[PDB]
Structures are given as structure tokens and as C-alpha cells.
Design a protein around this nucleic acid. Structure first.
Ligand code: MG
Ligand code: MG
Ligand code: ZN
Ligand code: ZN
Ligand code: ZN
Ligand code: ZN
Ligand code: ZN
Ligand code: ZN
Lengths: 104, 104
DNA sequence: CGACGCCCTGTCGCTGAGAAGCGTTTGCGTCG
DNA sequence: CGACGCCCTGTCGCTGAGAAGCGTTTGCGTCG
């Protein structure tokens, strides 16, 4: 099985530090293969704070989106998503427009 | 100080023997003050397998529910709860309907 | 943010805290 | 609902599964 565990983070567990770590420009990202996380949209594994899909039926990391990708491709802000207890990722909503999802 | 330590139990540590020891009928429970565990709902201390709340902010035994109580009062199966890495107890979800939690 | 002056002389953050289980305890309804 | 007889001898439900991220990767139009 190649699927990573999907751990839902409660909104109360979101801290002001990781809010400040939401990426505001894709060129400022820091890459780390060990401590980083992959945005589903741009497919870059970086250390900036990314979204957490809170649908229990979700799986893997398809719910992780960086700052620039979420706003530019879906008009949503990562800060709002992290504080929405009912937030679902675009793949869970069937609206993902990444190069793979819109191809199929 | 009067509160029993709450230890979050990883899903990978759940054994088939524990799943088999889930109570299917409250009349079949085995009481033991030393080796048993208390269900928050029915407040009986018995040896059957009970749920483990995985909310870090949880405490004590409020997250421990027996098989009959979880399905009859919440429509959930202890086996599913033990294998759910995001499972929170009804008191953590604020939906507990035991005689104490609905009293206030 | 923090000294500054004003009158009504003042207050929040963090940590770790926040029971458990024995006793009197088990659904519904007609009935003696 | 399930045997029962019929001819065309038969099929669905759950479970757990359903990637992730490095490499070749970043919008538009102009114009040399
Ligand atoms: Mg105490
Ligand atoms: Mg503690
Ligand atoms: Zn991205
Ligand atoms: Zn999702
Ligand atoms: Zn996609
Ligand atoms: Zn119980
Ligand atoms: Zn809990
Ligand atoms: Zn309760």
C-alpha cells in the first residue's frame, strides 16, 4: 500500500506559528524531502503550511494545498481552510483542476 | 490527581484478541474491579474491550465506551472506532447523551 | 509596543488542569 | 422470501483499496 495515513487536524490544534508559515509566494518556498509536505496542485514538497482536508472519507495527501495554489486555482485562503471544521479539499469536492485531475 | 492517565493508543497496536473481546450483549459482561475498564455511558467496570479516544485534549476515562453502548446510543461500532485514527469520543464531540452529560 | 496624560486606578497568558465506579443499574407496554 | 419448474445453467456484496514527489516544473504578450 502506497497511501500515506490521512490524519485530520482539529481547528483548535492550529497555531499562530503555522498560520504565519502559510506561503505567500511560490518562489519563497523551502524544499525539504524529510520535513516538507507536498501540495497536491503544484506537486512540490516544501515546508510551508498547507491545508488539511477534514473529510473522513478522504485519503492520502490529496487534501494538502499550498498558499499560492489554493488562492490562484480555487480562490480560497489556507488560513480560512485550516479554521473551517467542515472544509473539504477540491478533490473531495470533485472540482480539482490540477494537470492530472482535469485530464481524466 | 484523581484522574486516570489517558494514553492514546495507535491503531496499529490494536490486536485481534481485543476486537474479539468487544462485548456484543451487556448481559455477557465480566466484572473485575482490578482488571476491568469503565464505560463512560453505562458506568460499568468490565473486562470487555472499550474505545480509545484519540483526541490529545481528552482526559480520564470519558472516552471509554463499551460495545453495546456505542452502537445503541451512537450508531457506531467499537471495532470501527478502535481502527479510526481520528476517532473522538462523544464527550469530546459534545454529543454525549449519558445521564450526566445531558443533565447539565 | 510603550512611555505619556487622563479619570471611572484598572488585567490576560500559560501550564496543567478538567473522577471514577460501586450500587440502588438495563428497552417497550399491559397487569396483578 | 424462497422453493419450484423453466430454459437461455446463470452473480452481487464487503473489505480495503484508491501514491507521492522528484524532475524535465511557474502567468500573459512582445520581439529580436
Ligand atoms: Mg483532581
Ligand atoms: Mg495532562
Ligand atoms: Zn501548490
Ligand atoms: Zn479530501
Ligand atoms: Zn488534482
Ligand atoms: Zn457501556
Ligand atoms: Zn475524548
Ligand atoms: Zn457523558
Amino acid at each position: 500500500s502506497m497511501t500515506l495515513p490521512h490524519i485530520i487536524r482539529p481547528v483548535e490544534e492550529v497555531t499562530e506559528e503555522e498560520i504565519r508559515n502559510i506561503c505567500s509566494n511560490s518562489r519563497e518556498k523551502i524544499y525539504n524531502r524529510s520535513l516538507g509536505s507536498t501540495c497536491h496542485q503544484c506537486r512540490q514538497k516544501t515546508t510551508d503550511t498547507k491545508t488539511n482536508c477534514r473529510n473522513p472519507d478522504c485519503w492520502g495527501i490529496r487534501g494538502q494545498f499550498c498558499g499560492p495554489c489554493l488562492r490562484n486555482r480555487y480562490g480560497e485562503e489556507v488560513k480560512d481552510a485550516l479554521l473551517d471544521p467542515n472544509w473539504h479539499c477540491p478533490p473531495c469536492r470533485g472540482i480539482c483542476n490540477c494537470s492530472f485531475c482535469r485530464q481524466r
